Amino acid sequence: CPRFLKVKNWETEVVLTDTLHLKSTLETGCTEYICMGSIMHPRPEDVATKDQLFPLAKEFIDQYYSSIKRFGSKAHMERLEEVNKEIDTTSTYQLKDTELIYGAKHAWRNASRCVGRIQWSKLQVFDARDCTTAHGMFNYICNHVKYATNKGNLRSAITIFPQRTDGKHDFRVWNSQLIRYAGYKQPDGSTLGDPANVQFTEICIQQGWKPPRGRFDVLPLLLQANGNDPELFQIPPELVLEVPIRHPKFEWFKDLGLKWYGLPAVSNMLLEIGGLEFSACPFSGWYMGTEIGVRDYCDNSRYNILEEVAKKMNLDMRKTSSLWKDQALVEINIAVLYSFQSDKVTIVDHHSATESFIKHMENEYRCRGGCPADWVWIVPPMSGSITPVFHQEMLNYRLTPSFEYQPDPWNTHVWK
Amino acid sequence: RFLKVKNWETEVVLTDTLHLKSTLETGCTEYICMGSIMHPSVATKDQLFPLAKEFIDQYYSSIKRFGSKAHMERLEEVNKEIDTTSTYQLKDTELIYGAKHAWRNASRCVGRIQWSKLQVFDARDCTTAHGMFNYICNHVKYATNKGNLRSAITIFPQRTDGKHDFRVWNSQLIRYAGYKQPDGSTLGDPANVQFTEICIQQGWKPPRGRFDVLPLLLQANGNDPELFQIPPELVLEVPIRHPKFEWFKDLGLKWYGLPAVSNMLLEIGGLEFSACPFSGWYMGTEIGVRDYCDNSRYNILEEVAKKMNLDMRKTSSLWKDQALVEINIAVLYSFQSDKVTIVDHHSATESFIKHMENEYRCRGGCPADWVWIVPPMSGSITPVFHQEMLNYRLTPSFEYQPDPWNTHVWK
Numbered sequence A: 001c002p003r004f005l006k007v008k009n010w011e012t013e014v015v016l017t018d019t020l021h022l023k024s025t026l027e028t029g030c031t032e033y034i035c036m037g038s039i040m041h042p043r044p045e046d047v048a049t050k051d052q053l054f055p056l057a058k059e060f061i062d063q064y065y066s067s068i069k070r071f072g073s074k075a076h077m078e079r080l081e082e083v084n085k086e087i088d089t090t091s092t093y094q095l096k097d098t099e100l101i102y103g104a105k106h107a108w109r110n111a112s113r114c115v116g117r118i119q120w121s122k123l124q125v126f127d128a129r130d131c132t133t134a135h136g137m138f139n140y141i142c143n144h145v146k147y148a149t150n151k152g153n154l155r156s157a158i159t160i161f162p163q164r165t166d167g168k169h170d171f172r173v174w175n176s177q178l179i180r181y182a183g184y185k186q187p188d189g190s191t192l193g194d195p196a197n198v199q200f201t202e203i204c205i206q207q208g209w210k211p212p213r214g215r216f217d218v219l220p221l222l223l224q225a226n227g228n229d230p231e232l233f234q235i236p237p238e239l240v241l242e243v244p245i246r247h248p249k250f251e252w253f254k255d256l257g258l259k260w261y262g263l264p265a266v267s268n269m270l271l272e273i274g275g276l277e278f279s280a281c282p283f284s285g286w287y288m289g290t291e292i293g294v295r296d297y298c299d300n301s302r303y304n305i306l307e308e309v310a311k312k313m314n315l316d317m318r319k320t321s322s323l324w325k326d327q328a329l330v331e332i333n334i335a336v337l338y339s340f341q342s343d344k345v346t347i348v349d350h351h352s353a354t355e356s357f358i359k360h361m362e363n364e365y366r367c368r369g370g371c372p373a374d375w376v377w378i379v380p381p382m383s384g385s386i387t388p389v390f391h392q393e394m395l396n397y398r399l400t401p402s403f404e405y406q407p408d409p410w411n412t413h414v415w416k
Numbered sequence B: 001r002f003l004k005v006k007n008w009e010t011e012v013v014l015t016d017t018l019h020l021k022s023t024l025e026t027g028c029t030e031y032i033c034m035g036s037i038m039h040p041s042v043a044t045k046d047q048l049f050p051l052a053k054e055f056i057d058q059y060y061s062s063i064k065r066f067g068s069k070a071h072m073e074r075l076e077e078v079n080k081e082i083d084t085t086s087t088y089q090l091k092d093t094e095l096i097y098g099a100k101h102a103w104r105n106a107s108r109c110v111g112r113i114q115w116s117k118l119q120v121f122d123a124r125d126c127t128t129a130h131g132m133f134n135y136i137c138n139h140v141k142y143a144t145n146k147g148n149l150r151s152a153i154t155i156f157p158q159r160t161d162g163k164h165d166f167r168v169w170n171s172q173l174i175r176y177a178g179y180k181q182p183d184g185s186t187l188g189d190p191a192n193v194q195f196t197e198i199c200i201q202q203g204w205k206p207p208r209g210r211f212d213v214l215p216l217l218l219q220a221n222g223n224d225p226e227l228f229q230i231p232p233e234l235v236l237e238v239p240i241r242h243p244k245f246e247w248f249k250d251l252g253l254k255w256y257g258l259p260a261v262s263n264m265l266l267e268i269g270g271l272e273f274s275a276c277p278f279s280g281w282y283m284g285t286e287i288g289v290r291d292y293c294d295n296s297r298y299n300i301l302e303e304v305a306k307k308m309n310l311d312m313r314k315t316s317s318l319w320k321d322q323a324l325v326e327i328n329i330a331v332l333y334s335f336q337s338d339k340v341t342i343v344d345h346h347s348a349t350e351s352f353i354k355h356m357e358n359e360y361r362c363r364g365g366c367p368a369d370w371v372w373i374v375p376p377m378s379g380s381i382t383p384v385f386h387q388e389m390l391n392y393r394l395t396p397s398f399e400y401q402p403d404p405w406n407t408h409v410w411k
Ligand code: HEM
Pocket: A108, A111, A113, A114, A115, A116, A117, A119, A123, A156, A157, A158, A283, A284, A285, A286, A287, A288, A291, A348, A353, A377, A403
C-alpha cells in the first residue's frame, strides 16, 4: 500500500496528503477490480475470543496513551498488563472512564459519513454501564434527551449502556432513533404518518402500544436490557421539543400542518472500542436542514409532500422540464430553516455545514494526517455542486473506534 | 461471486455477474475507496496480442459466431499482423462495435440508454490537420442537424510510436474563450483561460468577448498544431431567456447546442485512438448548474439572485438554491423553444434507471459511477440517488490522457 495519497480540490486547487489511511483496520467492500462506494451496507452467538481480543485492546490502549502524550510510560505499560490479565482471567475487560470518553469521541471523529464532525471533541459522554433494567435504560435516555435538547440550544451527547458479554445478554434500543413518528399502513394500501417507521410501529402495537393513529405520533421507546424481552415506555411529551413548519413568505404553508422534532438521536448503531462492543449507545447532535426538508419530507417513500406544495404554489406539474419538483423542494427547505431559527432550535443549513466540514477536513489533514470521508454521504441531497464538498476529492477508509451497523433486534432476539 | 444492488426507493434488487469479466483496476483496495477521486492512478507485440484476442473473441461472441470459421481466421489474421508490423488494423465492423461499446461501458455517463444509436465516422485515412478540420466540420454539421442532434464519433488514426499522435487540443470542439483580465478577474469562460492563451500565442486574434467561439487547434501525425475557424453557420447557439422573468434575456447569456468532447482516448483491443471527438446532446444541468454556477466557471449566481431581489446576507435563506433552479428552468425553456435537443435531469436519470434494468437483464450488469451519475442539483428527488451502483472497468473504453501541451515536443 502506498504511503502518501493525494486528494485535490478541483475548485480551489488545494492538494492534501493522506498518511492516516495506513492505520485503517476494517474492510470497505471495494476490491482492486470493483468499487462499492455507493452500496449502503457493503452471528449473535459469536463474541470475540481471547486471542482476537488481545491485539484489538493493545491497539486501542496504545492509541489512547499516544494521544495523552504518555506512550511507553509506566502508566501505559501497567494498563497494558492489567488489560491483558483481565482478558486472560475473564475473556473480556472494562474500559476506564477516560478511555470510554476518548473512544466515543473518536468513533465520531472516525465516522466517514458524518458532515458534522468539526464538533467531534465537544461530545458529552454519559456512562450508563451500571444499568441493569429497561426502566433504568428509560431513565438514562430521558436524562439524555433533556440534556441534549437544552430548551433548543442543543448539545451533542451519547449514552453508553453495558457492553456485550456472551451475545445472549445484549442491551438494545429497538428504536432506530429515540424520537421518531409512527407510520400506519391502511387497508386500502395508503400510509398515515411516516412510511419509514411502519414495521417498527407494528412491532410496538403488537407489544401493547395503543396508537393514537395520527400523522405525527411520537413512538414509544422499546428497550431491551441484559438480553431480556424489550419493554415499552412513553417519553414524557414535555421532553420532546417540536417545531411547527411555516414559510417566511407563503402564509398558506402553515396550513399544511407540518412539524418536526428538534433532536436527531440515532439509537440502533453499535459502538466498537478496543474490540469491545456497545450494542446500545444512542447519540444525538442537531439537524442539517436537508435531513428534514429534502429526505424526511420529499422522499417518495417518506412524507412525500412535493406534490401538495407544488399545487399550493400553482406550478405547472405536467412536464418535468418546468422543474416544479426542484422549485418546491427549495421552498420546503427554506421553510424548515426559517421555522427552526424562529423558535431558536439549533439547525445548520447545508452551505454552512459543508463549508465547516472542508475547514475541518483541512485541519485533520494537517494535525492527524488525514480525514476519512464518504463523498456519497457528505454531499447534501440537494444543490450538490454549489456546496464546496462536491468539488473535494475524499478518501474513504475505516478507522477504529467506530460506529457500525448491526442487525435489527427483532430479527435476532430469542423470545423468553 | 454474484453481487446484488438494491434500489432503496423501489426495493428492486438486481444481480451483477458482468463485473466478473473486468480485468482493469479501479484504484480502490479492500482498505481504501477512491470512488470520489477524479483520476485514480505505447504497447508491445506481447502486450498487444492477448488484448486483441480478447476483443476479437467478444466481438465474435456478440455476433453469435464464437469459434466460427471467420472467428478463427480473424484471430490468425490478427496474429500475423502484430508479428510483422507491431500493431494491427480493425475491420470497419469491429471499429463500430468497439466505439459503441466504449460508450456502453462508460460508467460515468447517464446518457447510455442511447449507446447503440451512434454514428461512427472512420477517419483513419487522415494525414494532415487540414484533413482533420474537414472531418470535424462534417461531424459538427451531421451531429447538429439543425437542432435535431444526433450522436456521433469521429475516429482518427491510432497511436503508432507515440511520436506521431493525432490530437485535438481543444477539450471540446465548441467552447468559449476565457481571458485573464488586467484587474485580476476573468472574462469569458475561466475553464479555458489556459487554452485561450495558447491559441492567442499561436496567432489567434481574440475578439475579447463573453462568448467567443474558440478556434480548433489540431495536431496530425505528431506535427505542431494548426488553427482553424469553424464556419459560424455550423455553430448552433441558444440565447437563454426565462419563461416568466422577462429581465432574464437582458443578462446577455447564451450557450452552444452541441457538446463534443475531444480530449479523451478511445481504447479498442489494445489499440489507442488519441483523437476521437464524440458528441451527443446536453443534459440541462451541465450548462445551468456546472457551466454557469461553478465558482470557477461563469459564476452567475450573485447576478441572477440580485435581479430576483433575494435576501443574500444569510446562506440559510437558500438564495443560491433559488437562483440555481431559475437558471436551469431558463436553459431548458430556451433550448426547447428553439427546438434544440436537450434533456432535463429528471427525464435523463429516469431513462438511466430503465437502461440499468435493460443491461442487467440482457448483459448481467451495468457499470455505473454514482458520484458522476447523480446530477449536481436536486440529487435525492431523482431516482438514481436511491439506486445502488457497482463501478468497474470494462473494455473497449474511453480513458483520460495528458493535455498535449505538456507532452508535445515542438519543432
Ligand atoms: C452535531 C451535529 C451533527 C450534524 C450536523 C451531523 C450531520 C450528519 C448528517 C447530515 C449525516 C447524514 C445523515 C443522513 O443522511 O441521514 C450524518 C451521519 C452520521 N453522523 Fe453526524 N451529525 C452530527 C452529530 C453527530 C454525532 C454527535 C455523532 C456520534 C457521536 C454522529 C455520528 C454520525 C454517524 C455514525 C453517521 C453515519 C450514519 C450512518 O452511516 O447510517 N453525528 N451526520
